[PDB]
Structure formats: structure tokens, C-alpha cells
């Protein structure tokens, strides 16, 4: 294998068709190579088109102005576009699972979505306000984000402990395993399932018989779970009340149960009441803690800073997956640093994500580099935004994809770029357009209409010169 | 995702493979003195030989396609001290060996030729070549109707005294693609690498050098500067390093942006994107690396093919 | 994570793993006077204990008073409104000045502390606190969201200052360390040691150009060079010339400066090699670093902040790239957990300011309090919390209001147990000016604190009363009085 040979590689005009070869004796094969992790699927271009529509439709609102309703109405539409983006991506992920299965691309797209769910939950619902401003929407997004990030508790683990595997004479729920999985369910808002795992073993059994006192706790506790408030921050204020009353009553009362079963029920009640110490104890990952704190302790984003800190002291960020850290960054205020990671999962999603974050005004162009200026074409630099940068890159990337359907997206993206001289753009289009993969008459007319719209005379003149030889002699 | 490799059909080693403007065609040249052209069938996404033919009396080292706005034209450089130009005659069967007619021959070179590159279309059918004689030569098809009317536009001594020993020599060319930038081209000759620019006097003058190379420069290519104001040219040296130079004209400034030895051995091929967005490098390690620029303008390896 | 203080180092009561003894402790009305004791046979000593890391010094109360003055003087500007066109510009004007005032008061304090005891654990912490503050000013209290071109002079000055006060290196105790003139290798010239260069680049990376030049005029400027290779003598010389005029006021002059530098590195790049194989490169690198080669600036950087600093000085002076600069810098050298200031700075630079407060609160409660305050004034942190369906819940001292309001109010309460009547006005003023909380909520808090005021003079008493008047707590005045008669 280790023969030092002269390998040569040439990138082709088409992303999906490059070439490798070797200048050595008895090595006369040509190896067509396509760029690693490239999306050629129809599902993808649909996604791209879908996202471009939202971008185009955002109109003046894709920009953020650093009449009292313009503020409120602006967020209204931006927050909706965010939902649109999320939707388009779910659909995409869907069509990908059906077509190719749970491949490497599927995993990355979900990760990309998880980071987006988290982003929406934190900045595209409350608009800087607190959970009381809209308890329903918030908790919904939160509970959704959490239960789509990872699979656990996977039902393949539910049966794992209900294995009915009796090996020091287990009482089916006197096991520490049972409870952790009950609290876990609660911490994740998965109350329905939580209730089920209880009505599974000793609701009426060991309890309705052994200790009639604790039977009442474990029962009307399940009752409170059944009505955890998700719309009125008032109803919650009163909910946490009955819960704290319950934990106190039971706290000092008739102990007609095992020494362990005694506590295993207090803890269950403590967690539901919001005991910080406990919510951390039965949390497997930082995000279970973070989620719990908001659900059972105090539902205020003014404490997220603290919640996140405590959560991470309990369970560190798991570097296995690429989404956890970006979420930690989102929650902790530094949004800008999720872009590099998302750009790795999918260039497209990252591009538009950065875009809508600029629309919301969560990231802006801090740049200012001249008092002496007037050629410095920079449509593609750090001079303008971090968003402008990412959108423009995506445009260029689309040009080598060779899909004539997306070329309009590419050019449109460049044309609508909220930054850069009309002349700077003119030049960029002047160089890209000639590469448009036209075939139809309608295709050619499109090229021309763009030469008109931008006044690229000497370019419509070459398109036609290629045409004088591929249009005056081709469509024969 | 690797695709089904295929045989070129060459007996002796293959030196260069080049894409046409649209990326649907490829031209190959080897030591067996043949030039093969492959077509990418629309229906069955396979590469299939369009035509092969004997074109030189010696080993063919370089090749290149002209802008489509001048027709279907390929140019070849061989160790037989010549450069030949061909034009496809669509009225011939493919694989007939007679699908490409020689349009001319350039014999001015008195030493073998290592490279030939057409100039950016916005300058007309023009081209350059460099060989053992250490003399770069530019040719112009003054009258775009007579694709035989190839006049000699310029001659420059890259090496004052061409060493001329143990043919342990290398030369490369690469024009600045830029449409909105003054005509200029890069040239590598052994350890040196220099840039030429057209003057107000219509003559080439040396406008700068890309310092730092501590061995033979195997490859160099100017990147498409779409969007940017500056220029970027990369070089794959024998000392095992990829280098990317930022050239600004405020006449020309020269910054070194990145150096990469990830290859641990000689970098044979260095290539660019159509947008100059991705840069490729290949070498001894038998690996191809793709590089993207950071937001800070540094370059990062976005993938390693093998 | 906690401070394990030595109650009474000289004579400790608990020693044997034996009879786990019943230790009892009672916090006193005075921070500096608490008490520990034991309910066991032959343990009849009382141990007066003062709260770990408490500042009783006069230097400290001066500091506190100084900071309270700035806070009070900030007037309406200590608040941030989320005269029309200028209120914005004029607001930053004053806030940015107050930031300078705060920094000043802390330098003075650190000064009076070094003279008093010298270099006590307290000195180290206060410097750390200042380093984090220098960094904070450099990034948000100069350019007001703009880029370095907006004011190249001030910025680079603050940056260069922040960097050269964070750590001591290169300490002159290390300068001589390499200029030992030790020739333990056949002809070890005065610089042919990578050691010499690293310390030259380091100086450059830190803007320490004066010193940088000196280390050159130390060994082979004219020596090995003016003789051996006349070509490279010219590079190394007019390079030192450019260093002498590194622009610090015009972002124009810098644009042209980096020009001559890049010209120089290119000329030398491909030219007469009449020097050693190594000395050849050691000079290119020196020239690359000055030109801004990213690859190189990282190479000769010992800590992330040297890289970060270099990038801004020699590559591109734009904060739009700090995100990238920081990332590259940290890939090269991780954050050093030895000291408490590095991470907070990384946080500042990277946008999450709020998370420096917990750490600064550990170095010094006071500084942290006012830091949080001015960050709210700038509008860098705000109260995200909100109310209910327009409906008690008047717990001033909570997370309900700001993170700043919280820290200021805590500091106020902490001052009350300090027993220094000088600071009591600060304590009450801090509470009274708290930009959040009902006039009635505050009334109650003052109503409970005031009775503890350590009055002695007549003027002291008149002050208490004036506050009972100002807040309408006459019943409380009639109470401190009931202590007078029965005192």
C-alpha cells in the first residue's frame, strides 16, 4: 500500500463530478470523485426552494432597524418565518428518512433541528419577555425541544426494567430503577407516560392494602400530574400550592410502608414540587435538569443563567453529539457561536438560521473599517454581516451544484443580499451567470432577463455567442 | 461516496486531465502520445470515450480547453518541443480517431514543453506555454475567424540562464481568471514562482514573486476571485507544503495566508473551485484534501478523500 | 470550592477522631465578631471568630465611599432607557466615564493595599478583579458597538494596557534568564537560540515594541549582520524602523504601515541568503508575525490572550473578527485555570458578560456589585423578569428584579453588619436608589435596618432622624429614643 505515488486531483465545474488520477506506471485508471457530503437529492432542492421562499417573503422584515406596532408586528412575522423554517426542515428530514433511512445525513439534520427547536424556544416566542407573557406556547416548545433531542427514555428501556426479572425478591417497584425512570418522565414533562408506569405495578396493589395513608398521597399526586397547568401562569401558581401542601402533609404522617418506599415517594413529591436539590439528583443530563427547573421550580427565564449552571455542575455537556454545546450556547446568550457547528451539519440550514437571527436582531454587523474609501468589492467577506457572509457562500455553493432549479435561488440570494453595492453584485452575477446550465428556451430567456435586469451587456453578448454556436446551430 | 473508476485507455502514464467549461467533458493526455476526450452521458451517468487519437511524436504533458465562445478547442504541449491546437468537427463519428482536426503547430520552443494554458476569454484566444528553454511564450489568434492564424505575442526569460541538467526541472502556468482585474499570470520555474502583469505598454513585466518555496513547485493555480477584491493563488511544493498567497493591488502586495504540510510529502496537484470557494490538494500520502476559507481568511481542511 | 479558614491556628479545640464533640457557633451582630464554643467536659474556652475574608481596612471603606460617589453621581444615567438624538450619545459619554472612574478608584485601592501589607492574598484578588475590568472596558466602554476605526488610539491603548497588567511575564527576571551569555555549544551566538526569538516575538505580540527593539540592539544588530550579510542587515534594521512607528491613532496610517511591512517581508522573502540556515528563517518569522501571518501569530504565542492581542495589532484590527480570533487562540493555548481572571475575560470577549459576575463576586463583593451596576447602565445586562395579570410580592432582595439590583442590595445588607457608620449612608443610599422596588418595599427594609446604625455623635443621631423623616418612619425614631433613656 505504502508506495509514494504522485496523486493528482482536479475539482470540476460540477460539485458532483471531480476527478483523481495518478502519474505513475501501470496506474491508468481515472477516479471520478464527488465532494464529500454533497446533497443531490430532490428532497434537498425542495428544502432550498422552500427556505428561499420564506427569505423572499420576509421582505423588508429580513432586515432589522436598530409605528409603535412596527416593533410588535415585526417580531410577529419573524417569529412565524422561524416556524416556517423549522417546518420545511422537518418535512425535509421526513422525506430523507423514507428515501435513504437513518443514514448519516438523517442524524445530522435532526441535530440541526434540535438546535433550532432550542433556538426558537428561547428567542422566537417570548420576544424578550418572561414565560408569563405566553405560558402555553413556551412550555410547548420547551417540552417539544427536549423530547426530540434524544430518544431516551426509549420504550426499549421501559420494558428493560419491567423485565419481571426477579433476582433479591424484587417488589417490581421497590427498585431504584423504577423510580429514576418515573422522575425522568416527570422532569421531561412526559406526565402521560409517568402516570402509566405507576398504574403498572403498585398503585392499588401494595399500597391500597399495606398503608392506606400513603395510598392517598400516591393517588391524588397522580391527580395533580393529570392537570399540570400549561396555559395559565396563575393556575400553575396554585398548582405548585396543592403540590407543596401534599408534600408537607405526607412529609410528617403515618409510615405504614417500607423504609425505602417511604422516601422513594417523598422524592417523587419533592421533584414535582420543585426541590432544586432533588431535580438535580434524578437528572441524567443537563437538559433534563434545565427543563425540570422551568417546569416545577420557578418558570422564569431570569433564572436560566443559574439553572444552566447548576445543571452543568451535575452533568457535563456530552461531546458525543454536536447539538448539546450549541444549545448550551443558545441558552447562555452566545448565539453567534452555533453557526460554525450548524454549518457543519448542513450549510443550507446554517445559512438561513444565521439569516433569521439577523432579522430578529440577535446578531448584527459590528464592522466599520474605513473613513477613506470609494474598488473593494467584498460581497464575500467579513466586512458585511456574519449572516450576509453565510448566505452569499451558500449562493456560490449552489452554483457548482448544477441544478438549474436552484440557480434562481442562488442569484436571488445574491441580489437580495441586504449589503453590498449594486455594482459589486453586478460583477458577481456577471461572473456566475455564464455557468447557468440552460437547455430550454425558457432557460435562456431567464438568463437574458437577468442580464437585462442587471445590465450585463457584454455578458448577454457571450451567452448569445455561445448560442450563435449552440442556439443558431443546435435547436435545428 | 466513491464512484465506479474507469480505464483511460492509455498505455503509458497519464499526465493531465482537464474539464471543459461545462464540466461535462474531460480531456486526457499521456506519454503514449494520445489525447482522449470523454463525454458524460446524460442518460447513463457514466463517462464514455468520445474520441482518442495520436497527437504528438513524444510524451504529451499538458492540455487545456478554450472558452466555449470560440468553439470546441483543445491545446496540447509535448516533450517534442511543440504545442498543437485542435478543433472538434461534429460531423465525424466518435472514436473514429478523426474527430479533432489539428488547427496549427507552434515550434518556436527549442526545449521540451511542460505547460500550456488558455487565457481568460475576456482577452481573446490567447495562451501561454513554458518549457526547458525557460522561456514563457504567449500566442494570440488575432483573427477569431482563422483558428490557424496564431501569432506570437510575447517572449519572456523566466530563468535568465536555464540550468538544463538532469531534467529534474518543473514549470507551471496559471492565468488570473478575473474578468474585472488587469491581465496577469503566474509562473513557476523550479524553486521560484513569479507573477507577470500587462503594462500600459502592452508588454509583460514581473510584478511580484511568491517567496518561501524551499524546493520544486509541482503545481500552482490562480483562484477565481468572484466577490473578492484581492487575488489568491495556491501552490503545491515538493517540500510538502500547500501555500496560499493573498495578492492585493493598491503595485502588487503579497501576503502569505496559509501553509499546510498535512500531506507529509510532495503536493503534486493543487486545484480550485469554479467559484474559488474550495481548494484541493493531492500528494504522496495518496490523499486529496479540500480546503475552505475561515471567516478570518485562514484556510481549513474541510475533508480528506483517499 | 470553599475557603477552609483556620479558626484559631495557634490553639484548636478539636483534634481527636475520638468523641466527635458538640461544636456550637453563633453569628454576631458584627461581621468581625462571631463566636464558637463547645458543650463538652474540659472545653471551656470561647473562640471569637471573624467571617472569612472580611475587609475591615480603612483603604476598603475609602474604596466603597469612592464607588458610592460615582454611583450617586451617575444620576438618571445609572439607568438605561431601552436631547432626543443625543440622549443616546450623551448617555454612553457619561457611563463610559464612570467606568473609568470605577477603574481608577480600584487602582488607587490596589495601590494603598500594596503599601499597607504589600502582596497579601487580598492584593492578588484585587488585581485579578482589575484585569477582568480592564478587559471589560476595552471591549464595551470605548467603541460603543463600533469598530476600532471609530477610535484606534483609545482602543489599542486599553487593549495594550489590559494585556500588560494581567500577568507579569515577560518579567525582567526572565529577560536576563536567557541573556546569561552561556556558550555551552560551539559558538552559541547571542541569538541563534530559539529562546531569543520567541521572547522577541512575544514582546511584539504584546505591543511591547520599545523592549522588543532593545533586545535586538542587545546582540547582533550591527554585529553578526552588518558584517556577515549586508542584505539581511537592511531588513532587520528598517524593520526595527517600522516597529518604531507602529500607528496608534490613524487606522489609515496603519493601513499603509502594514503595507511597508508586507513589502519588506516580500523583498526579503526572495533575496540574498548570506546567513545561517536558521538565522534565515528566524528573521522571516519575525517579519511574518509583524505582517500578521495568522499561522505565525499563533505559533509564537504562549497564551490565548497573546494570540488574541496579536491578531488585532498586526492582522486585521476589527472586532468583527474577535469571535474567530478567540477561537483560533484557544485552539492553540487552552484557558489556564490557575488564575480566576482568564475565563471571565474569555466570556467578556465572547459576548456572555453576565457570567463574570459570579467570579468577580468571589474576588471582591464590592467591585462585583458596582461592575454589575455599570453594566446595567450601559445596557449590557437587563432585568428579563416579569409580572402577573396586573395584580404582596414585594421581596426587593430577590431574582424578581435585576441581577444587578440583586447584587447591589446584597452589598448594602453586607455593609450593615460591618459596623462602620461611614458606610451606613452608602448602604441606605444604595437601597434608596435601587432602580427597582416599591417606595413602600424600601420603606420597610430601611425600617428594619436603621435601628442598627452605630450612632454616637449628635450629628449621627440627626442623620438617623433625617432618614426617618425622609421615609416617614416616625414610630421608629420614637424607638431608637426608647433605647437612649434605657441605654
mmCIF file of N, CA, C and O in Angstrom, chain A residues 67-79 127 133 360:
data_model
loop_
_atom_site.group_PDB
_atom_site.id
_atom_site.type_symbol
_atom_site.label_atom_id
_atom_site.label_comp_id
_atom_site.label_asym_id
_atom_site.label_seq_id
_atom_site.Cartn_x
_atom_site.Cartn_y
_atom_site.Cartn_z
ATOM 1 N N UNK A 67 -46.597 53.127 14.405
ATOM 2 C CA UNK A 67 -45.151 52.937 14.358
ATOM 3 C C UNK A 67 -44.641 52.294 15.637
ATOM 4 O O UNK A 67 -43.464 51.937 15.737
ATOM 5 N N UNK A 68 -45.531 52.170 16.618
ATOM 6 C CA UNK A 68 -45.197 51.542 17.893
ATOM 7 C C UNK A 68 -45.496 50.061 17.700
ATOM 8 O O UNK A 68 -45.072 49.206 18.482
ATOM 9 N N UNK A 69 -46.233 49.781 16.630
ATOM 10 C CA UNK A 69 -46.609 48.426 16.271
ATOM 11 C C UNK A 69 -45.560 47.804 15.353
ATOM 12 O O UNK A 69 -45.453 46.580 15.274
ATOM 13 N N UNK A 70 -44.787 48.641 14.658
ATOM 14 C CA UNK A 70 -43.756 48.132 13.761
ATOM 15 C C UNK A 70 -42.846 47.171 14.522
ATOM 16 O O UNK A 70 -42.385 46.172 13.969
ATOM 17 N N UNK A 71 -42.603 47.478 15.794
ATOM 18 C CA UNK A 71 -41.774 46.638 16.648
ATOM 19 C C UNK A 71 -42.489 45.317 16.888
ATOM 20 O O UNK A 71 -41.968 44.254 16.576
ATOM 21 N N UNK A 72 -43.695 45.397 17.435
ATOM 22 C CA UNK A 72 -44.500 44.213 17.731
ATOM 23 C C UNK A 72 -44.851 43.387 16.496
ATOM 24 O O UNK A 72 -44.799 42.162 16.531
ATOM 25 N N UNK A 73 -45.220 44.062 15.414
ATOM 26 C CA UNK A 73 -45.594 43.391 14.174
ATOM 27 C C UNK A 73 -44.400 42.758 13.483
ATOM 28 O O UNK A 73 -44.536 41.777 12.753
ATOM 29 N N UNK A 74 -43.229 43.335 13.708
ATOM 30 C CA UNK A 74 -42.012 42.815 13.120
ATOM 31 C C UNK A 74 -41.733 41.434 13.693
ATOM 32 O O UNK A 74 -41.537 40.480 12.951
ATOM 33 N N UNK A 75 -41.721 41.330 15.018
ATOM 34 C CA UNK A 75 -41.480 40.050 15.673
ATOM 35 C C UNK A 75 -42.546 39.058 15.261
ATOM 36 O O UNK A 75 -42.272 37.884 15.051
ATOM 37 N N UNK A 76 -43.770 39.536 15.150
ATOM 38 C CA UNK A 76 -44.875 38.690 14.756
ATOM 39 C C UNK A 76 -44.508 37.861 13.539
ATOM 40 O O UNK A 76 -44.559 36.635 13.576
ATOM 41 N N UNK A 77 -44.138 38.549 12.462
ATOM 42 C CA UNK A 77 -43.783 37.908 11.199
ATOM 43 C C UNK A 77 -42.480 37.118 11.238
ATOM 44 O O UNK A 77 -42.404 36.024 10.680
ATOM 45 N N UNK A 78 -41.458 37.661 11.891
ATOM 46 C CA UNK A 78 -40.186 36.957 12.008
ATOM 47 C C UNK A 78 -40.395 35.640 12.752
ATOM 48 O O UNK A 78 -39.951 34.595 12.304
ATOM 49 N N UNK A 79 -41.075 35.697 13.888
ATOM 50 C CA UNK A 79 -41.347 34.507 14.682
ATOM 51 C C UNK A 79 -42.099 33.450 13.878
ATOM 52 O O UNK A 79 -41.957 32.250 14.125
ATOM 53 N N UNK A 127 -40.205 36.963 22.872
ATOM 54 C CA UNK A 127 -39.680 38.255 22.436
ATOM 55 C C UNK A 127 -39.076 39.074 23.571
ATOM 56 O O UNK A 127 -39.389 40.248 23.722
ATOM 57 N N UNK A 133 -45.800 35.889 29.871
ATOM 58 C CA UNK A 133 -46.228 36.542 28.636
ATOM 59 C C UNK A 133 -46.979 35.568 27.723
ATOM 60 O O UNK A 133 -47.832 35.977 26.934
ATOM 61 N N UNK A 360 -34.250 38.893 13.517
ATOM 62 C CA UNK A 360 -34.695 39.087 14.892
ATOM 63 C C UNK A 360 -33.847 40.159 15.546
ATOM 64 O O UNK A 360 -34.283 40.827 16.481
#
